[PDB]
């Protein structure tokens, strides 16, 4: 069915080694579920009706004069999305444990606002957001965003949870903060983890049970 | 030439300029035939299928235009109705053997983009106005030349995409789509869909 | 063809010097030389656009070129050679028939009678040539050639009769001037006066007439209404001269005392030309506050009724401030559109020069403004340059309207090009806005040079586009790209033709082009180790020829854009060429630096194509010279050049007492 | 005031002969890298087409990109970050150089534009909408939100989100303008369009941006009696393609043409510059004759609604050879002008004007009155101020490249508290951004260093607990680089770098353990480990290891084996520290820091658990006995040291039992040796005021890999990167790509841990 899919990925050294495994087990099947059957080179962008994928990659504060979030424009090709998922290079990090989840979520919110101004042929669609993270959030409010500046991760994930965006978390290391954020993004009113170590909670989307 | 010979050879070839000047039909680039379907091709209009150049006797220093690809002659012949066998007799095509002749393919693409330009001029002042006649003849001619693999479909389409990229030629795109529909509807079952 | 297209008004001595130079560079026989002059003149006449350019071309061929030949005869058995060249030309029947169709008469007859009058040709030669031409020809309005050939004596006699204001009879002056304002008569007089060197005296005469009719004397309406018309006729013809034949014929070039005339200052500070953009709030456009209120009250009174004493220079200087206050009043809203129509009618009605002064200030002011702020002021031009106000015209109104519409076309054209606005006065601007709107300018340059090579000669339109590209991309870009397009030729014939054309193209600004060529292009080709594969024998011999022709012609020693731009230019050639006669003249510095480079290349190891280049450069320096560019050669080159392989010594040495010692050393020890 | 920090000259590669000079470009990035071109002219003209990258802390090492530019390079332009470099020459050809393998020594351009034949005369990156303003009157305000504040600027061409596109805009010598937009994918969209319909010469041009996402491009044709025209450009993307919309703005003429006394002099406009990109309303023009010149400042200010009026002009100068505008974005209003005149803060109010004699004038922004004068004792053909505007770099009319320091009060003497507050304000500005602070360390005297360090720590406190998170390693790097500059404080820098390294190991080891099941939830196993190690003060290692759920601390025994060298460094540093206890040395700070000793305890406990899982991961100690448990011995001594410092308000001097037991440690084990990171070759310690270093390019006035702790040989065979600030060396490509702990190696791909860039070092070949 029509879907506005937004992936939010932590592009840091953590999630570096574990990303290839996560993609085969969880991310790639999730794209197929939105796009029935695996994509191969015939899928064309430009159908404004239909499922539209997008990436948001974020970083920590060690990329000091560079920007924090790299966003990609929406595509209707699942194949271009797969090439974008290959094209991420995980180079960041340093002496820290946290990352800028608030930035990635705020730009995901701006993506969903631009999607909502885009699709008017349908009032509401399946608005799905995934967060592929390996790290607890920073305590910084969001700085490099307009209309969602000065907001912590809890406020932003409340605004994700209300208005009916289906929020999911795929993490290769089981963590408390990520679980708390997932519990908070509750939509108004099954073991999918193939590996025991992986923590995967999916509010929306169907992934083969393992 | 090599930097040690230099003038010694170059001036020598320049003294063979008058002999080449004797052996040149003057205004040969601008002489055009009347296309008859009769066959029995006069061998004056034969071009080289590799490079669209006139076949020249000798190694003389001929005039600078005779070393250029004669695209004007080939476009004039392709724009005429019933110039099917004459283009094969020009470019040496044989129809027992399929070849993917490239310069024919590029000339057909440039003919399509010229038709698209001339359709985008107005096409609405005169209803017939030679535009839709040109598109019908383009349909027939291009069906034959892509069908026997003298040219190929996907290289033609993507080169056509590179010519129309950014030029902003949109008023008669329906005609171009119609011509492509003639190819696809003619030969979808023979080739794979990736073509 | 260049001297015909750009400076018809140039002196013949510069052209004779340049042509004798070209005849000495490439050794040209005299019959082929004069044949190329006549062929160029006729081809340029045929390719001329209809209008003033055709009159100018008829004058250049009929009057200036015969005078040039006379000067060549004095400087140089010329009659036999010019007769040979005329038979050479008379073989070319299609050229002469195309010319005769444009001339509407046999133009070769007028040429042969004119060259008979000047004394280039004997009379028997003239008569058998006209017999041959009539035999080859066998297989109500006067044409322009008769009009021009008879109009040049009228130029001299009109000078001598209007020295004295027709014995101070202004009614007579007005009638004769109205006859001049009639169709094409002014243009005929100006073309004849330009081709024959008498445009300066003509401009002095109309300027002095203007100064006489500026103030006026105690008068009733009928005498003053003549004096204001004399101001209009003199002003409008002076503006037409300055817009057609350049502004430098209007200048006085030495005014002892402060009494510069009104028109010279107005043209200096207030009239748009091609390369002149004007400051609308220059102090020239703000004369007073006292007179301008009297003038706006004057324009709001009614029909002036007070033309009996106006001091027209003061009025014309004050219109700019007047229409500035009118514009401020209309921008606030305190003035209605209908009163604006009344003020524009009071300006443009009785005297037409007021409209020209106002439109000049309006063009400056609209050029400074932004996009959205312009909309009102353009309407002012639409009313000032509109069709005629009627029923109170003094006399000769339609002809002044026609001349004024031409002047306002050439004033407004640039501003009305910036925003797409059609004012539609009714070609009169045949070579204007020639470049394509979006295409990068190297494609323009390479296409025009490709067509000039494939023809074999340079058109008039091609000369104008080459001028605009030299002004636009600058000298270095121009000369470098044309030399690149030379160096990718591979044939001997095309390289020699390209060089013979590029010399004439570089004659737009020969001096600056030689500084760029021998200073930047050639040292960059000789010093770069990757570049000198481009210096192979086919293009390389041609390039060495072009460099030495450029060096000689710049040493022995021209358009108005080029004059303005070299006056703009600041550079320190002492700092550019540090160098390890004057030697503060930059060309001597470039030549000394180039010869140091040539000696360094000849002396070094690793002989390649660049060594062949500097060999060829020195050989055509020897051959092209009469005797001096080679005065700057270092004396070590005398030794080294025969180390790398007689006359190349004995010419290059310049023969000082120490110079004999180096000469006798090299020649004996070959 | 002005002091020449250093003068770097080419050796024997000057004396350009027989080919005339060319104008030079110069560009100082946010990271301190100068990109510049010079007229070398020896055996090739490509020696005038090489782009030299000079890291400003190690100038001898000059990289030389052989750009494939067939004509002379007009413009160089760094990114808004410091990571890409745009270079454009005559005849089109804009190239966009990016780093290769994140080395500052290898550049390669894959992306570029081309408008063939037309010379590029202005070039700029597009604006990304980030702009901040510095309130100097709030320098003491104790919160960084009050001192530096973002000013709500809009980026030209936002694309589907808040995210700006990156791209450039160039202006040719014809009327053409071109915009190239880089996609997030490798695609690039180009579009060219004429500026106005009247196509004309553009001999000088400049580009500023506005709020609202409009570019404002100023054109002049050099004649100085013709108007300096202005165009508003608006970029858009229509469905696949870039689209440029231009509109004429009010032009200006220039004074000294309406002077009417002698108006004919100064006939050439030679420099046109907006006062800063994103400050589009003020314009600096420079008319010049052959000998004299005039600079002028103009402003658009409205009343004809918009109209250019003059602000100020100089009287008469020498011929201005180069112009450098500042980059520090001061707040520029009236109160801040007052307080920056009272407290003599002058970093953002200066332009530098070189002249055709030796002199250089630092002149005011608003009313161009000369603030300082530096006589060279030959002219500056290119100048550039720094991002904190304390130093200006400049290329001369020879091979010489010089760096001058401008004092922040321009030579007027200040009391020490004001100089402290100025330099502290600038270091805080470099801390909030990510810019480099090297130019500040040009101005730090030794005698103030310690006081400055104190102020940094007091400003590291009293921020709002997320700033303290994000400014940790930046303030450790700034503390180390400051403490390098004084002989009293030179001993502590090693400690700071090991402190960085300790945290860099500690978190990563606590990052690797993925808890297989969540027992006692809401605490991650890093925090469970820290809680358990801080409440259990048992001196034995077994009694701590028992209570720590050791089925959770499991790895795959492959990465667990590959962690051997980092665990070796942990054990060796602990042993070195405890043996160093009886004695100012490389370990003196750690003996009294309770937190670092706690971290070392936690790592020893997880090392013990991982050794029980696989015994090959353990560090090795050459023991002078065979019935010994060396790990338990070191843990006993570490707990007995740490219980000294984990007390509340303690400062307990260590008792004599620990002293004699740690005297016995060289008897029981062999204390190996250690490499300490800041191998100092930085110039700032070497420099002195009033003495300039005269350097040659390429002359440069127990080998370990410090990040993966591998011993290279005597003369190492594999090639290496060196950090540009601390000096740590790593080998360039990983030794075993299969067994590589990518959680540790992928942290330092783009930078070092101290923050500086990597820089490829050449092999010896002895
Ligand atoms: Zn470092």
Q: Nearest CA to C48 among C39, C56, C37, C38?
A: C56
Residues of D in contact with C527 (CB under 8 A): 18-19, 41, 45
Query: Are the Cβ atoms of C541 and B7 closer than 8 angstroms?
Result: yes
Q: Tell me the CA end-to-end span of chain D in Å, nearest whole number.
A: 46
Mutate to test the interface with C, among B10, B63, B167 (most CBs of C within 10 A): B10
D264 and D281 in contact (C-beta within 8 Å)?
A: no
Chain C interface with B: residues with Cβ < 8 Å: 454, 491-494, 536-538, 541, 608-609, 612
C637 Cα distance to chain centroid? 42
The coordinates were experimentally obtained by: cryo-EM
Q: Nearest CA to C520 among A142, D460, D19, D720?
A: D19
**Token duo for residue D564:** 């051997």
Residues of A in contact with D163 (CB under 8 A): 69-71, 107
Sheet holding D279-288, edge to edge: D268-276, D279-288, D293-299, D309-313
φ and ψ of D103, to 5 deg: -95, 140
- Tally DSSP H helices, then E strands, for chain C: 36, 0
Name every residue whose Cβ is closer than 8 Å to that of residue A133 and which is 6 or more positions away in sequence: A8, A9, A10, A15, A99, A101, A169, A171, A178
Collect contacts of D623-627 with beta carbons under 8 A, ≥24 apart.
Answer: D623/D668, D623/D669, D624/D667, D624/D668, D624/D669, D624/D670, D625/D668
CA distance D95 to chain C (A): 19
Residues of C in contact with D192 (CB under 8 A): 438, 440
Closest chain C residue to the Cα of B12, Cα to Cα: C492
Q: Nearest CA to D323 among D365, D291, D289, D281?
A: D365
CA distance B8 to chain C (A): 9
Name the CA dihedral angle for D61, D65, D66, D69, rounded to a multiple of 10 degrees: -140
Q: DSSP for D477-511, please give it.
A: HHHHHHHTT-TTTTTSHHHHHHHHHHHHHHHHHHH
Query: Are the Cβ atoms of C445 and D258 closer than 8 angstroms?
Result: no
Ligand 1 centroid distance, CA of D727 (Å): 6
D466 touches chain C (CB under 8 A): no
Q: Nearest CA to C233 among C160, C162, C317?
A: C162
CA distance A146 to chain D (A): 7
φ and ψ of D380, to 5 deg: -80, 115
How far apart are the C-alpha atoms of B189 and D553, rounded to whole Å?
A: 62
CA distance C422 to chain B (A): 24
B149 and B100 in contact (C-beta within 8 Å)?
A: yes
Sheet holding D103-113, edge to edge: D73-78, D84-89, D94-100, D103-113, D758-761, D720-723, D729-731
D248 and C371 in contact (C-beta within 8 Å)?
A: yes
A195 touches chain D (CB under 8 A): no
D302 touches chain C (CB under 8 A): no
Residue with tokens 């029935």: A36
Residues of C in contact with D305 (CB under 8 A): 373
Query: Are the Cβ atoms of A61 and D524 closer than 8 angstroms?
Result: no
Residues of B in contact with C531 (CB under 8 A): none
**Token duo for residue D204:** 């000088």
Residues of C in contact with D193 (CB under 8 A): 438
What ranges in D270-321 are assigned the alpha helix state H? none
D299 and D308 in contact (C-beta within 8 Å)?
A: yes
Query: Are the Cβ atoms of B64 and C492 closer than 8 angstroms?
Result: no
C312 and C231 in contact (C-beta within 8 Å)?
A: yes
Helix or strand run (H / E) with residue D634: helix D630-645
How far apart are the C-alpha atoms of A63 and B44, rounded to whole Å?
A: 71
Ligand 1 centroid distance, CA of A68 (Å): 22
Of C491, C493, C612, the CB nearest to B3: C612
C635 and C655 in contact (C-beta within 8 Å)?
A: no
How far apart are the C-alpha atoms of D638 and C344, rounded to whole Å?
A: 101
The SS3 assignment for D231 reads strand
CA distance C380 to chain D (A): 16
CA distance B18 to chain C (A): 12
A98 and A135 in contact (C-beta within 8 Å)?
A: yes
Ligand 1 centroid distance, CA of D748 (Å): 10
Of D163, D504, D510, the CB nearest to A94: D504
What part of D 439-468 touches A (C-beta under 8 Å)?
465-467
Residue D674 carries which DSSP code? -
Helix or strand run (H / E) with residue D529: helix D525-535
Query: Are the Cβ atoms of D223 and C564 closer than 8 angstroms?
Result: yes
Q: Tell me the CA end-to-end span of chain B in Å, nearest whole number.
A: 46
Residue D136 carries which DSSP code? G
Residue D704 carries which DSSP code? B
Residues of C in contact with B62 (CB under 8 A): none
Helix or strand run (H / E) with residue D62: strand D62-66
Query: Are the Cβ atoms of D119 and C477 closer than 8 angstroms?
Result: yes
How far apart are the C-alpha atoms of D27 and D85, rounded to whole Å?
A: 9
D159 and A73 in contact (C-beta within 8 Å)?
A: yes
D632 touches chain C (CB under 8 A): no
How far apart are the C-alpha atoms of A162 and A143, rounded to whole Å?
A: 22
**Token duo for residue C14:** 């510069």
Q: DSSP for A139-150, please give it.
A: SPPP-S-SSSTT
How far apart are the C-alpha atoms of C573 and C554, rounded to whole Å?
A: 16
C239 and C250 in contact (C-beta within 8 Å)?
A: no
User: What is the stated resolution of the deposited model, in angstroms?
Assistant: 5.0
Length of chain D measured in residues: 766
- Number of Cβ atoms within 10 Å of the Cβ of C329: 16
- Tell me, yes or no, whether chains C and D touch by having 3 or more C-beta pairs under 8 A: yes
Residues of B in contact with C538 (CB under 8 A): 1, 6-7, 10
The SS3 assignment for D289 reads coil
Cβ-based burial of B58 (10 A; exposed 0-12, middle 13-18, buried ≥19)? exposed
A72 touches chain D (CB under 8 A): yes
CA distance D513 to chain A (A): 8
Ligand 1 centroid distance, CA of A93 (Å): 14
B6 touches chain C (CB under 8 A): yes
Mutate to test the interface with A, among D162, D517, D757 (most CBs of A within 10 A): D162
- Tell me, yes or no, whether chains C and A touch by having 3 or more C-beta pairs under 8 A: no
D20 touches chain C (CB under 8 A): yes
How far apart are the C-alpha atoms of D18 and C579, rounded to whole Å?
A: 8
Q: Nearest CA to D185 among D114, D110, D107, D125?
A: D110
CA distance D7 to chain A (A): 29
Name the CA dihedral angle for A81, A83, A86, A87, rounded to a multiple of 10 degrees: -100
Residue C248 carries which DSSP code? T
C362 and C319 in contact (C-beta within 8 Å)?
A: no
Paired with A55 in beta bridges are A7
Of B1, B3, B5, the CB nearest to C608: B3
Residues of D in contact with C569 (CB under 8 A): 268
The SS3 assignment for D104 reads strand
φ and ψ of D209, to 5 deg: -125, 165
D388 and D372 in contact (C-beta within 8 Å)?
A: no
Residue A135, CA distances (Å) to A14, A175, C73, D37, D553 in order: 8, 8, 98, 44, 18
φ and ψ of C261, to 5 deg: -75, 175
D441 Cα distance to chain centroid? 13
How far apart are the C-alpha atoms of C334 and C342, rounded to whole Å?
A: 15
Q: Tell me the CA end-to-end span of chain C in Å, nearest whole number.
A: 47
The SS3 assignment for C14 reads helix
Paired with D180 in beta bridges are D168, D190
Length of chain A measured in residues: 210
Cβ-based burial of C470 (10 A; exposed 0-12, middle 13-18, buried ≥19)? buried
How far apart are the C-alpha atoms of D436 and D684, rounded to whole Å?
A: 14
What ranges in chain A are assigned the alpha helix state H? 19-22, 28-34, 78-87, 101-118, 153-161, 176-184
How far apart are the C-alpha atoms of C386 and C426, rounded to whole Å?
A: 10
Mutate to test the interface with C, among D15, D199, D287, D288 (most CBs of C within 10 A): D199
Paired with A56 in beta bridges are A8, A71
The SS3 assignment for D256 reads coil
Closest chain C residue to the Cα of B11, Cα to Cα: C492
Sheet holding D693-696, edge to edge: D380-385, D391-396, D401-406, D2-9, D693-696
D765 touches chain A (CB under 8 A): no
Residue C122, CA distances (Å) to B191, C79, C82, C116, C128 in order: 86, 7, 10, 7, 10
How far apart are the C-alpha atoms of C147 and A46, rounded to whole Å?
A: 71
What part of A 91-110 touches D (C-beta under 8 Å)?
91-98, 107, 110
How far apart are the C-alpha atoms of B95 and B88, rounded to whole Å?
A: 9
Residue C123, CA distances (Å) to C112, C114, C126 in order: 10, 11, 5
Cβ-based burial of D602 (10 A; exposed 0-12, middle 13-18, buried ≥19)? buried
Ligand 1 centroid distance, CA of C259 (Å): 78
**Token duo for residue D514:** 């993925």
Of A73, A93, A172, the CB nearest to D184: A73
D369 Cα distance to chain centroid? 32
D475 and D431 in contact (C-beta within 8 Å)?
A: yes
Name every residue whose Cβ is closer than 8 Å to that of residue D710 and which is 6 or more positions away in sequence: D565, D704, D731, D735
Ligand 1 centroid distance, CA of D678 (Å): 8
Alpha-carbon Rg for chain A, nearest whole angstrom, is 16
D224 touches chain C (CB under 8 A): yes
How far apart are the C-alpha atoms of D712 and C661, rounded to whole Å?
A: 70
- Number of Cβ atoms within 10 Å of the Cβ of D100: 12
């Amino acid at each position: 069915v029509v879907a506005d899919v937004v992936f939010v990925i932590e592009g840091t050294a953590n999630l570096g080694p574990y990303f290839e495994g996560l993609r085969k087990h969880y991310l790639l099947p999730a794209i197929e579920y939105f796009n029935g059957g695996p994509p191969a080179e015939t899928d064309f962008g430009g159908d404004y009706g239909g499922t539209q994928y997008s990436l948001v990659v974020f970083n920590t504060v060690d990329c000091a004069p560079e920007s924090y979030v790299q966003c990609h424009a929406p595509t209707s090709s699942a194949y271009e999305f797969v090439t974008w998922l290959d094209g991420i290079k995980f180079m960041g990090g340093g002496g820290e444990s946290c990352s800028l989840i608030a930035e990635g979520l705020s730009t995901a919110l701006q993506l969903f606002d631009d999607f909502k101004k885009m699709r008017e042929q349908i009032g509401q669609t399946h608005r799905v957001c995934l967060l592929i993270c390996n790290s607890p959030p920073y305590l910084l409010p969001a700085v490099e965003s307009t209309t969602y500046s000065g907001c912590t991760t809890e406020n932003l994930v409340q605004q994700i949870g209300e208005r009916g965006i289906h929020f999911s978390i795929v993490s290769p290391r089981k963590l408390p903060a990520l679980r708390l954020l997932f519990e908070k993004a509750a939509p108004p009113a099954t073991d999918v983890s193939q590996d025991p170590r992986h923590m995967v909670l999916v509010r929306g989307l169907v992934l083969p049970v393992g | 030439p090599h930097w040690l010979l230099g003038n010694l050879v170059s001036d020598f070839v320049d003294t063979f300029r008058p002999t080449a000047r004797i052996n040149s039909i003057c205004g040969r680039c601008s002489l055009l035939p009347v296309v008859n379907n009769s066959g029995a091709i006069c061998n004056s209009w034969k071009l080289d299928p590799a490079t669209l150049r006139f076949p020249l006797k000798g190694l003389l220093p001929y005039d600078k235009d005779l070393f250029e690809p004669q695209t004007a002659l080939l476009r004039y012949v392709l724009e005429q109705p019933y110039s099917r066998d004459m283009v094969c007799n020009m470019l040496g095509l044989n129809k027992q053997h399929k070849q993917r002749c490239p310069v024919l393919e590029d000339q057909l693409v440039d003919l399509v983009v010229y038709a698209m330009e001339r359709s985008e001029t107005e096409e609405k002042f005169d209803d017939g106005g030679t535009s839709q006649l040109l598109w019908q003849h383009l349909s027939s001619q291009l069906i034959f030349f892509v069908l026997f693999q003298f040219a190929s479909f996907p290289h033609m389409v993507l080169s056509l995409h590179q010519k129309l990229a950014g030029r902003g030629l949109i008023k008669g795109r329906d005609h171009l789509m119609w011509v492509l529909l003639q190819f696809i509807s003619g030969s979808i079952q023979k080739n794979a869909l990736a073509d | 063809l260049l001297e015909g297209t750009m400076n018809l008004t140039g002196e013949t001595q510069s052209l004779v010097e340049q042509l004798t130079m070209v005849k000495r560079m490439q050794h040209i026989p005299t019959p082929l030389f004069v044949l190329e002059i006549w062929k160029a003149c006729f081809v340029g006449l045929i390719e001329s656009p209809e209008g003033t350019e055709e009159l100018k071309w008829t004058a250049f061929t009929f009057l200036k070129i015969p005078q040039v030949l006379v000067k060549l005869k004095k400087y140089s058995d010329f009659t036999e050679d010019v007769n040979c060249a005329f038979e050479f030309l008379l073989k070319l029947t299609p050229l002469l028939d195309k010319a005769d169709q444009r001339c509407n008469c046999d133009c070769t007859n007028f040429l042969l009678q004119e060259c008979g009058k000047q004394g280039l040709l004997s009379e028997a030669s003239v008569n058998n040539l006209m017999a041959k031409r009539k035999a080859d020809r066998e297989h109500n309005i006067q044409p322009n050639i008769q009009l021009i050939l008879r109009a040049e004596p009228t130029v001299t006699n009109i000078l001598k009769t209007m020295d004295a204001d027709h014995s101070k009879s202004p009614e007579g002056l007005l009638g004769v001037l109205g006859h001049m304002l009639s169709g094409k008569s002014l243009d005929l007089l100006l073309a004849a006066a330009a081709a024959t060197g008498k445009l300066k005296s003509f401009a002095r005469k109309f300027i002095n007439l203007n100064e006489f009719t500026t103030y006026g004397s105690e008068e009733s309406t009928k005498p003053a209404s003549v004096r204001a018309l004399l101001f209009d006729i003199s002003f409008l013809m002076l503006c037409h001269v300055a817009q057609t034949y350049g502004s430098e014929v209007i200048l006085s070039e030495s005014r002892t005392g402060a009494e510069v005339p009104f028109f010279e200052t107005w043209m200096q500070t207030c009239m748009p030309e091609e390369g002149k953009i004007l400051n609308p709030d220059h102090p020239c456009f703000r004369p007073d506050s006292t007179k301008v209120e009297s003038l706006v009250a004057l324009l709001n009174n009614s029909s002036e009724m007070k033309l009996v004493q106006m001091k027209w220079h003061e009025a014309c200087l004050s219109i700019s401030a007047a229409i500035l206050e009118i514009l401020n009043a209309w921008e606030n809203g305190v003035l209605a559109f209908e009163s604006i129509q009344k003020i524009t009618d009071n300006i443009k009605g009785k005297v037409c020069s007021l409209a020209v002064c106002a439109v000049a200030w309006l063009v400056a002011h609209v050029r400074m403004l932004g996009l959205d702020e312009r909309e009102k002021s353009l309407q002012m031009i639409r009313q000032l340059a509109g069709p005629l106000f009627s029923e109170n015209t003094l006399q000769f109104y339609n002809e002044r309207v026609v001349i004024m519409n031409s002047i306002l076309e050439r004033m407004c054209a640039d501003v009305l090009q910036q925003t797409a606005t059609q004012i539609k006065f009714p070609d009169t601007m045949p070579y204007w806005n020639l470049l394509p709107p979006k295409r990068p300018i190297k494609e323009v340059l390479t296409d025009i040079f490709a067509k000039v090579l494939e023809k074999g000669w340079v058109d008039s339109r091609s000369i104008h586009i080459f001028d605009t590209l030299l002004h636009m991309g600058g000298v270095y870009w121009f000369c470098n790209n044309l030399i690149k397009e030379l160096l990718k030729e591979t044939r001997k014939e095309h390289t020699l033709r390209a060089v013979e054309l590029l010399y004439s193209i570089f004659c737009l600004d020969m001096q600056q082009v030689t500084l760029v060529l021998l200073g930047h292009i050639l040292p960059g080709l000789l010093t770069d180790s990757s570049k000198w594969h481009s210096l192979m024998d086919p293009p390389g011999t041609a390039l060495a020829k072009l460099a030495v022709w450029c060096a000689l012609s710049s040493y022995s020693s021209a358009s108005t854009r080029q004059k303005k731009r070299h006056r703009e230019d600041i550079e320190d050639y002492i700092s550019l060429f540090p160098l390890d006669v004057n030697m503060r003249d930059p060309l001597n510095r470039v030549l000394a630096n180039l010869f140091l480079l040539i000696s360094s290349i000849l002396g070094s190891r690793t002989a390649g194509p660049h060594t062949q280049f500097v060999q060829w450069f020195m050989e055509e320096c020897v051959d092209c010279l009469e005797q001096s560019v080679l005065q700057f050669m270092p004396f070590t080159t005398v030794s080294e050049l025969v180390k790398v392989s007689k006359v190349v010594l004995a010419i290059t040495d310049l023969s000082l007492p120490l110079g004999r010692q180096v000469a006798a050393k090299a020649i004996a020890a070959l | 005031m002005m002091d020449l920090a250093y003068v770097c000259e080419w050796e024997k590669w000057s004396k350009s002969t027989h080919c005339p000079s060319v104008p030079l470009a110069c560009a100082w990035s946010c990271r301190n890298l100068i990109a510049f071109t010079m007229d070398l002219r020896s055996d090739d003209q490509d020696l005038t087409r090489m782009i030299h990258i000079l890291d400003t802390e190690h100038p001898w090492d000059l990289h030389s990109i052989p750009s494939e530019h067939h004509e002379a390079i007009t413009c160089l332009e760094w990114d808004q970050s410091g990571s890409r470099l745009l270079s454009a020459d005559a005849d089109g050809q804009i190239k966009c150089w990016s780093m290769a393998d994140h080395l500052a020594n290898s550049w390669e351009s894959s992306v570029g534009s081309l408008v063939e034949g037309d010379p590029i005369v202005a070039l700029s990156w597009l604006h990304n909408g980030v702009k901040l303003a510095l309130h100097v009157e709030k320098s003491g305000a104790s919160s960084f939100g009050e001192k530096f504040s973002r000013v709500k600027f809009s980026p030209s061409l936002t694309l589907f989100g808040g995210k700006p596109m990156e791209g450039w805009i160039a202006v040719t010598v014809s009327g053409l303008v071109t915009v190239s937009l880089l996609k997030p994918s490798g695609q690039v969209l180009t579009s060219t369009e004429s500026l106005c319909r009247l196509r004309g010469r553009v001999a000088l041009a400049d580009i500023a941006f506005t709020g609202g996402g409009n570019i404002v491009v100023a054109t002049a044709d050099g004649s100085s009696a013709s108007p300096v025209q202005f165009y508003k450009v608006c970029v858009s993307v229509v469905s696949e393609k870039c689209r440029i919309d231009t509109e004429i703005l009010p032009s200006l003429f220039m004074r000294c043409t309406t002077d009417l006394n002698r108006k004919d002099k100064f006939p050439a406009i030679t420099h046109l510059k907006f006062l800063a990109r994103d400050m589009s309303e003020q314009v600096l023009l420079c008319a010049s004759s052959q000998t004299s010149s005039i600079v002028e400042c103009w402003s658009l200010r409205k009343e004809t609604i918009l109209k250019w009026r003059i602000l100020s002009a100089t009287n008469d100068l020498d011929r201005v050879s180069a112009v450098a505008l500042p980059k520090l974005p001061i707040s520029l209003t009236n109160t801040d002008l007052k307080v920056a005149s009272d407290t003599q803060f002058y970093p953002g109010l200066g332009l530098a004007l070189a002249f055709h004699d030796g002199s250089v004038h630092i002149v005011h922004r608003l009313s161009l009155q000369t603030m300082a004068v530096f006589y060279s004792s030959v002219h500056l053909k290119a100048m550039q101020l720094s991002w904190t505007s304390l130093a200006l770099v400049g290329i001369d009319s020879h091979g010489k490249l010089s760096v001058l320091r401008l004092s922040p009060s321009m030579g007027h003497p200040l009391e020490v508290g004001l100089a402290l507050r100025h330099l502290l304000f600038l270091l805080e500005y470099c801390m909030v951004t990510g810019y480099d602070w090297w130019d500040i360390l040009l101005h730090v005297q030794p005698s103030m260093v310690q006081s400055l360090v104190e102020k940094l720590h007091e400003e590291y406190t009293r921020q709002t607990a997320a700033l303290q998170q994000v400014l940790s390693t930046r303030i450790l790097a700034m503390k180390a680089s400051l403490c390098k500059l004084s002989p009293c404080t030179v001993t502590r820098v090693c400690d700071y770098h090991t402190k960085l390294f300790l945290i860099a190991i500690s978190s990563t080891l606590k990052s690797l353990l993925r808890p297989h099941f969540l027992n006692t939830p809401d605490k991650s196993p890093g925090d469970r480990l820290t809680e358990i190690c801080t409440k259990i003060t048992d001196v034995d290692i077994d009694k701590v290891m028992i209570n720590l759920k050791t089925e959770e601390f499991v790895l795959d025994m492959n990465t667990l084996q590959a962690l051997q060298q980092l665990l070796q460094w942990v054990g060796d540093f602990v042993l070195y520290l405890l043996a160093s206890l009886p004695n100012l040395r490389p370990g003196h700070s750690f003996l009294r820091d309770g937190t670092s000793l706690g971290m070392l305890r936690e790592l020893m406990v997880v090392i013990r658990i991982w050794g029980l899982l696989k015994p090959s991961c353990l560090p090795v100690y050459t023991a002078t006995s065979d019935t010994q448990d060396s790990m338990s011995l070191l843990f006993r001594l570490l707990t007995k040291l740490w219980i000294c410092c984990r007390d509340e308000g303690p400062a307990s001097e260590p008792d004599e039992a620990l002293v004699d037991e740690c005297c016995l440690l060289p008897s029981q084990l062999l204390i190996p040796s250690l490499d300490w990171l800041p191998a100092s070759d930085g110039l700032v310690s070497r420099l002195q005021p009033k003495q300039p270093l005269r350097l040659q390019f390429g002359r440069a006035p127990p080998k370990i890999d410090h990040l993966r702790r591998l011993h290279l040989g005597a003369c190492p065979t594999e090639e290496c990167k060196a950090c540009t600030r601390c000096g740590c060396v790593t080998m360039l490509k990983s030794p075993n790509r299969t067994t590589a702990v990518k959680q540790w190696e992928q942290r330092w791909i783009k930078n070092c841990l101290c923050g500086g860039l990597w820089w490829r070092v050449p092999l010896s070949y002895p």
